[PDB]
Amino acid sequence: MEFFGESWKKHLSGEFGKPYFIKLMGFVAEERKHYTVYPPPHQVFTWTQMCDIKDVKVVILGQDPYHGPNQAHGLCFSVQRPVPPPPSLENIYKELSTDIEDFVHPGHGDLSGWAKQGVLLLNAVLTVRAHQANSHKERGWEQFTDAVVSWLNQNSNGLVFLLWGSYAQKKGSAIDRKRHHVLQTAHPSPLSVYRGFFGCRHFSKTNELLQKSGKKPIDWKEL
Numbered sequence: 001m002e003f004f005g006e007s008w009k010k011h012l013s014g015e016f017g018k019p020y021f022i023k024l025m026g027f028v029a030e031e032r033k034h035y036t037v038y039p040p041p042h043q044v045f046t047w048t049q050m051c052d053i054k055d056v057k058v059v060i061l062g063q064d065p066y067h068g069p070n071q072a073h074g075l076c077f078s079v080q081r082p083v084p085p086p087p088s089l090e091n092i093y094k095e096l097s098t099d100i101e102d103f104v105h106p107g108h109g110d111l112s113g114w115a116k117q118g119v120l121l122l123n124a125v126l127t128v129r130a131h132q133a134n135s136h137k138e139r140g141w142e143q144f145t146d147a148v149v150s151w152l153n154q155n156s157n158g159l160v161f162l163l164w165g166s167y168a169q170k171k172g173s174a175i176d177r178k179r180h181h182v183l184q185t186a187h188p189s190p191l192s193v194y195r196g197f198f199g200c201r202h203f204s205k206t207n208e209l210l211q212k213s214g215k216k217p218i219d220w221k222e223l
């Protein structure tokens with residue numbers, strides 16, 4: 001395997017020599033010497049491994065990785081087999097079931113099948129100390145993932161951005177609405193899901209928007 005997918009590296013490596021990025025790398029490395037940090041190194045950049053950067057169709061922006069054992073693996077909201085889907089992911093699957101009648105629950109929480117279809121599952125902060133939510137907040141990841149969002153905004157066309165919650169909406173605030181499609185709703189967490197996420201129908205809406213972009217739809221059940 002590779003640490004960082006080649007097509008993504010080609011376009012994002014301009015970040016790597018910048019002072020914030022050097023500092024970020026040092027911070028994460030030091031944290032790993034004293035704490036268990038999730039995801040493990042080989043999974044920090046899973047979101048670069050699943051499809052070519054040129055083939056991104058949909059972008060779902062997250063915040064912090066899961067902080068429990070075996071959960072985070074470098075794709076926002078996803079958990080690898082055999083880990084049970086956390087409540088936020090169960091809510092995502094519940095909305096899918098009501099939104100698209102023909103959706104089939106895969107019986108696991110691994111969203112790799114979406115990533116392979118060009119659904120970028122990007123957290124803003126890409127590491128977290130075990131059991132400590134937001135422990136790596138504002139250490140440099142935000143600037144890096146802002147650079148990712150900026151690259152896609154400028155160099156791709158007709159993407160669908162799904163911005164769930166106020167944090168994601170802020171991170172996507174500068175997306176050019178004349179050049180990309182943006183859908184917004186509340187966050188799927190249990191505390192916020194009934195404040196707009198249930199009933200948002202973003203999955204069916206996304207596929208209709210992809211038609212306008214001249215692109216084939218996501219098969220949301222291909223998991």
Ligand SMILES: O=C(O)c1ccc(/C=N/OCCO/N=C/c2cc(=O)[nH]c(=O)[nH]2)cc1
Nearest residue numbers: 062063064065076077088165166167187189
């Ligand atoms: O800004 C808001 O409106 C808002 C509201 C509620 C929340 C809540 N989060 O609660 C934790 C739920 O689980 N999240 C998992 C999770 C896993 C992952 O890979 N990425 C990720 O972004 N989240 C966040 C933002």
